[PDB]
Structures are given as C-alpha cells and as structure tokens.
C-alpha cells in the first residue's frame, strides 16, 4: 500500500468463461442432512397450510418486556431447588429439638408447575395467574387449557419458550406455571400485570377462537401472481370500455 514501481493489480473479471468463479458462502443450496430438511419442511408447512383456531391461539404470545416483568416477579417465588432443599430440611431437623421448625410448617406461596396440578387448581378456581409455554411437543397437551381459563375466568398468558419455565425450577422444562396467591406486598404488582394479560387473552376469546392461521403463500408464488396482478392493474380499461 505504498508506491512501489512494481506492484500491479492483476484485476480479475468473472463472468462465464473469463475466469473461474470464486468460492463463496452458500447456505441456500447445500444438500442438508435428512433431519434438517425435516425441520425446514415442517416449519414451512405450518405456514403453508391453515392451522385450526385452537392451534392459532398459540401464536399471539406475550410482549417481551411484559414477560420480563412476569419473570422478574417469579424469580422471587421459584420453588426450592437442589442443595437448598437438603440444607433447609437438615436445618429444620435440627430446629425440631428447638421446637421452632419441622417439615410441617408454613411455606409462603410458591409456584405450581405440572399440568395436572395446574389444571386441577384451575378447575377448582384457586388460580390467580396461569402461564403457558407456547412450544409444547404434542400440542394436545395444552390445546384445551385456554378454553378452560375462559370458562372459569382465570387469567392466563402464552409465553415463549418452555426453557424459561424450566429455568423457573431446577428442571429443564415445565409446560405451565401458576400463581395461586402471592405475598400481599406484591399483590398489586401482580394485579397490574394480571390486568395487562387478561386485557388481551381473555376478553377477546371470541376473536381468538374465531381465528385462523397459516395459509400464507410462499414468496415465489407471491411474486408469480404479482406479475399478472401488475399486468391487469396496469393495462386495465384496455377496450374503449
């Protein structure tokens, strides 16, 4: 990059037969392995057809910052994980001789994870907030759940990721969680988010259940029809009519 009387560009000119094309990052053409092809095809199918209403309800998930308030709320409420369970229980065994604590004693309100437990307390109407992971392997696991919450007026929300609900315990995933009651000092902070949630997921159950999805035609065919629509819009009124 200095002036040397001998440095010379040797410019290249690509183009057919001029000089062989150079290797460049291809990611559109490669023969992907079978399972990767499978994931691509399924993801594309779920748009290229129409999902039913009870499946399309699973795509209007929460706003990220709202979910962040929900989670920061939960992280003061997560249940007892490993190496905490053991230490608390051992200390409680030692408090037995001091008459101040055993296994039977008050536990402040905590989360309720499993689907069976969550549905039980929903149908007993002991739930004040329900969260739902949106990507669950067999969707029939919780396809019914929003309808149940609509039947019994229990606030419920559709969050992204089962992984987050997993992180909300020591486990790896949890289909749902639910607050039954919370510490009063946090009751108001709960209720504000509760109202924000129920404004969007409960009062419009009509449009949710009426909703349809997918049916979105691929960009190739979008352009292919755009050609003829442009042609007809452009040359309309062709006859003196």
């Amino acid at each position: 990059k200095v002036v040397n009387p001998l440095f010379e560009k040797r410019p290249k000119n690509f183009g057919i037969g001029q000089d062989i094309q150079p290797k460049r990052d291809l990611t559109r053409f490669v023969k992907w392995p079978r399972y990767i092809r499978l994931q691509r095809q399924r993801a594309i199918l779920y748009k290229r057809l129409k999902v039913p209403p009870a499946i399309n309800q699973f795509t209007q998930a929460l706003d990220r910052q709202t979910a962040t308030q929900l989670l920061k709320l939960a992280h003061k409420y997560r249940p007892e994980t490993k190496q905490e369970k053991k230490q608390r229980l051992l200390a409680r065994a030692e408090k037995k001789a001091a008459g101040k604590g055993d296994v039977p004693t008050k536990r402040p309100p905590v989360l309720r994870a499993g689907v069976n437990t969550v549905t039980t307390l929903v149908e007993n109407k002991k739930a004040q907030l329900v969260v739902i992971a949106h990507d669950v392997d067999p969707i029939e696991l919780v396809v019914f759940l929003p309808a149940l919450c609509r039947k019994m007026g229990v606030p419920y929300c559709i969050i992204k990721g089962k992984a987050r609900l997993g992180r909300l315990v020591h486990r790896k995933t949890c289909t749902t969680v639910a607050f039954t009651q919370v510490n009063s000092e946090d009751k108001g902070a709960l209720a504000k988010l509760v109202e924000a949630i129920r404004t969007n997921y409960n009062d419009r159950y009509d449009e949710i259940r009426r909703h349809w999805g997918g049916n979105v035609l691929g960009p190739k065919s979008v352009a292919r029809i755009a050609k003829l629509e442009k042609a007809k819009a452009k040359e309309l009124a062709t006859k003196l009519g």
Binding site: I16, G17, I20, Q21
Partner: protein, 49 residues
C-alpha cells in the same frame, strides 16, 4: 461406440467452478471433426453441432 453405428464425440470442457476439465461424450452431429470448438448454452448462436 461398439454396438452402435452413430459414433460418439468425446469433448473436453473447462469446469467453471474449479481447476479441472470434464470430458463428455455426445452423439456426433454429422460433419463435425476433431479440432472444432463446440458452443453449448442459451446464447450460442446457430452452428452445426
């Protein structure tokens, strides 16, 4: 080409993605010879073979 009276033409093409040659065997159109340059593709205008 044994067992066929339509003799094959063996053609050397430069491979426009690497440094090598591909050698194909077409059905020799009548009247072509050794040492001809054969043009193949969308814009190669009318010539024999």
């Amino acid at each position: 080409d044994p067992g066929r009276g339509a003799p094959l033409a063996k053609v050397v093409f430069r491979d426009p993605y690497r440094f090598k040659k591909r050698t194909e065997l077409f059905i020799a159109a009548e009247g072509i010879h050794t040492g001809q340059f054969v043009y193949c593709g969308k814009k190669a205008q009318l010539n024999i073979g």
